Design a protein around this nucleic acid. Structure first.
Lengths: 54, 91, 37, 49, 141, 122
RNA sequence: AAGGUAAGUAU
RNA sequence: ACUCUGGUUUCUCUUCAGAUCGCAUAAAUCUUUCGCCUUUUACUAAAGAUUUCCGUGGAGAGGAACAACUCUGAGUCUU
């Protein structure tokens, strides 16, 4: 089982290289999603009151 | 501890050992071997930027080489003093 | 030499991601109007 | 000077101007270094060649 | 998408292809959430009843059923494949890939024509059928 | 011709294949104004030279205005120092040209290794 | 780089 | 004219980056405007927003070379 312990090394290496801006880009996309949903709400939330009334 | 610099003959012996796919001595070390081949462009980029200049016969560079001979990077950035570099290229 | 190195820095991610997703064990792969309905 | 070298001059200036115009300040990052995490793992060795 | 029958494992896909002896089995490999797959599945649902006599339509989730990803190259976002009497049928679509339809088709008549051509050719014994429409160009003007 | 170029400019203002080469039509350095065509190149006080271009050729393309100004304003005493410097530099460059000459001006016995390989490479 | 795979029986 | 003052180099890690991070300069995706248009994968070239990549500075931390004396200012600094 010397292969499944070697794929993890390269996978962790790739994750470490992605760690440069992972927090700084997954946070900006969060604010973009919130801003987009402020103007255009989700479809399920547009029927939340009606779904409640069922 | 810390990893020391291996003698230059180690990489030569490893590469001569890694002849071809026909040889049956190495057939199971695949994930360790070809998992690092995706970084081949860096090996392309690292040596081309460390190209010896016209005023140098031999340019020894530090090398970070895979333990299986799969890949070798020139682990060095060509840092130069800009007036010295410009004067050398003017010469 | 420097021009092709500047090309190289940009093209390295493409080749790296194309390779690493190719010789890996697991491979990975008009909708605007037919969306909201 | 001939026409082709002149056009070379304007095109080099064009690329220089485009680079200097469409330039954004580099984005903040956590400084993860490659060739430093290779040798951390037991898969790469260092030498001089 | 959520109306057509769903196959949940490779054995179910095997049995679905094996079970039908006089109808072409149309299988959509993909994901319910994929927009291309939603367009393809809504077209299939539109024509599901009309082709009842000579076609049966099933939906297979490749993430849930990755059993045929390697052999059938099910790596495009959407894939439509036709089988007849346990035999994959190829279509000369003009796209360069005769083994599958790997895009969403808008018109519901074109899919009916493709299924009808596949049924005719397969009942005649052919393994390749030339589609009535050449898909080397989207005919956008 | 050029007179109508100005009027044409005034009127215009108011009223598959890989191409490695750059088309000559893309050239912008085309002007009707004699001022903007034959521009006055920077003399740099007769002591500065454009980069890349060799200094020896640049010296003989000089306008000679500053050379005449120097030979006019200079007194005899300060003229002798410049004459001596010019003679010394001329002698040094003559020695350099004598050492760096073609093999046609050298005998076989006095050939150097560099000249030998130059002759062989011909 | 492609949109240029005849299909079918038989081992 | 005095006692204490504690280095520099280098290898890594963790973060923050306003600033020409960079006196240098690529690529990708998306959104618009175009030019080819014949279908993606490549493109024509401007704009906008992003991502990745080649590099960078500051700070903090952890080892090593360093071996430490002293640089150095603090001062009663002395005739």
């Amino acid at each position: 089982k010397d292969d499944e312990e070697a794929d993890a090394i390269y996978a962790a290496l790739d994750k470490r290289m992605d760690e440069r801006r992972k927090e700084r880009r997954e946070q900006r996309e969060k604010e973009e999603i919130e801003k987009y949903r402020m103007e255009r709400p989700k479809i399920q939330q547009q029927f939340s009151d009606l779904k409640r009334k069922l | 501890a810390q990893k020391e610099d291996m003698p230059p003959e180690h990489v030569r012996k490893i590469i001569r050992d890694h002849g071809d796919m026909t040889n049956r001595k190495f057939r199971h070390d695949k994930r360790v071997y070809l998992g690092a081949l995706k970084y081949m462009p860096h090996a392309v980029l690292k040596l081309l930027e460390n190209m010896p200049m016209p005023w140098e016969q031999i340019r020894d560079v530090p090398v970070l080489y895979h333990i299986t001979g799969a890949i070798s990077f020139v682990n060095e950035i060509p840092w130069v003093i800009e007036p010295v570099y410009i004067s050398q290229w003017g010469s | 030499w420097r021009v092709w190195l500047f090309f190289m820095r940009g093209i390295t991610p493409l080749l790296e991601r194309w390779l690493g997703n190719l010789l890996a064990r697991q491979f990975e792969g008009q909708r605007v109007e037919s969306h909201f309905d | 000077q001939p026409v082709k070298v002149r056009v070379s001059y304007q095109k080099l200036l064009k690329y220089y101007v485009l680079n200097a115009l469409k330039h954004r300040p580099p984005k903040a990052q956590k400084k993860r270094y490659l060739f430093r995490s290779f040798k951390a793992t037991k898969f790469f060795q260092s030498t001089k060649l | 998408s959520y109306m057509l029958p769903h196959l949940h494992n490779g054995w179910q896909v095997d049995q679905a292809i094996l079970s039908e002896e006089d109808r072409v089995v149309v299988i959509r490999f993909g994901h319910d959430w994929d927009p291309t797959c939603m367009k393809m599945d809504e077209v299939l649902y539109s024509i599901a009843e009309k082709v009842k006599n000579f076609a049966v339509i099933y939906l297979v989730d490749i993430t849930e059923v990755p059993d045929f990803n390697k052999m059938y190259e099910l790596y495009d976002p959407c894939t439509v494949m036709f089988f007849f009497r346990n035999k994959h049928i190829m279509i000369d679509l003009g796209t360069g890939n005769n083994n599958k339809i790997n895009w969403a088709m808008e018109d519901k008549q074109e899919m009916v024509d493709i299924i009808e051509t596949v049924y005719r050719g397969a009942r005649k014994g052919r393994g390749l059928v030339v589609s009535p429409k050449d898909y080397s160009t989207k005919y956008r003007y | 011709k050029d007179k109508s170029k100005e009027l044409h400019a005034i009127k215009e203002r108011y009223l598959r294949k890989f191409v490695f080469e750059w088309d000559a039509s893309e050239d912008t350095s085309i002007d009707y104004n004699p001022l903007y065509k034959e521009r006055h190149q920077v003399q740099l006080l007769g002591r500065g030279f454009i980069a890349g271009i060799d200094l020896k050729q640049q010296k003989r393309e000089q306008s000679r205005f500053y050379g005449d100004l120097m030979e006019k304003r200079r007194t005899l005493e300060e003229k002798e120092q410049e004459e001596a410097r010019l003679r010394k530099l001329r002698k040094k460059e003559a020695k350099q040209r004598w050492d760096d000459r073609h093999w046609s001006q050298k005998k076989l016995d006095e050939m150097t290794d560099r000249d030998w390989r130059i002759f062989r490479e011909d």
